[PDB]
Amino acid sequence: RTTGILADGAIRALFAGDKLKSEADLDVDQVQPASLDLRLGSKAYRVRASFMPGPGTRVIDKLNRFLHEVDLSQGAVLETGCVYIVPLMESLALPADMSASANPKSSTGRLDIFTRVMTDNAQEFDKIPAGYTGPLYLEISPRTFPIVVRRGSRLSQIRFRIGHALLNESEVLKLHETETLVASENPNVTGIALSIDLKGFGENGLIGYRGKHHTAVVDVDKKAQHDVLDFWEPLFARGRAELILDPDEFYILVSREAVHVPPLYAAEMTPFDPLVGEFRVHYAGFFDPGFGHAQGGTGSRAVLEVRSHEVPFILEHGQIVGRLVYEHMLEKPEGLYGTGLG
């Protein structure tokens, strides 16, 4: 391949050739199979509003045109409804044929934290232009849970690519023949469509979770230390297979489809556009090569954050909620310790 996504080996090579820089050595687990986690620096800037830097504008200038400074050396609480800009430890000097995009880590979405990566001269968020040299910034606004963050916190990730080696319908339908993309012959390719499972799981019929209010603060570095029942309310199928989505709430829900991303492909979750005005999958993110790897079954369900917009919506089982889009890897991932993806 001469077009596709950079695997971890390449991301590591980029760091070794100073095309990607950081304030410190990377975390051992910082480079994912087809993306890199980004870490917060030592200062957060509390802002009145989010902004677009614009053409020929450094992010630092707009900042200086506005503003409370928060030190993250130990840990700061970011409150819901509040907007913070954070210089990231990682910076770039990209090859002119290489671009990148950013998405929240999936655990970021489970805590309902709004984030945007910004570049100098930015006209769009979460997009790094081909050949970009400069710093990176994370805009952070917690929506449901107040959070604690510090120097090193990882809320976001960046995927690097040469060109845009997306698969079209035919390529996707053939990969499902060769490998298994959905554990079901055969999927609705359009990429592959994801629908909502509202029938229930287990003996009690658990469908998912709704976020709670006035919780304790969530430490984003120690997320497994927090009891489930004092942040999330479990939701159980009781009547018909359907759920009223209250627009002020956030819901952690699950796809009906068990999905697989083969090791020479990465994926990205996208909103189902025909219905963006009704409800949306929030915090759509990157899927790594090897997701839902064949085990004795193939494929994992996707966990989805769904919110309704403006008006309450009765979401029904089997409703299509997103589209998993596939893209070629440049090479096969080498894995966490460089000794294989498994």
Binding site: S107, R110, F201, G202, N204, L206, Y209, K223, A224, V228, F231, W232, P234, I252, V254, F291, G292, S300, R301, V303
Partner: peptide
């Protein structure tokens, strides 16, 4: 029971 922080399910 999946937990809200579940990875693969």
């Amino acid at each position: 029971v999946e937990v809200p922080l579940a990875g693969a399910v």
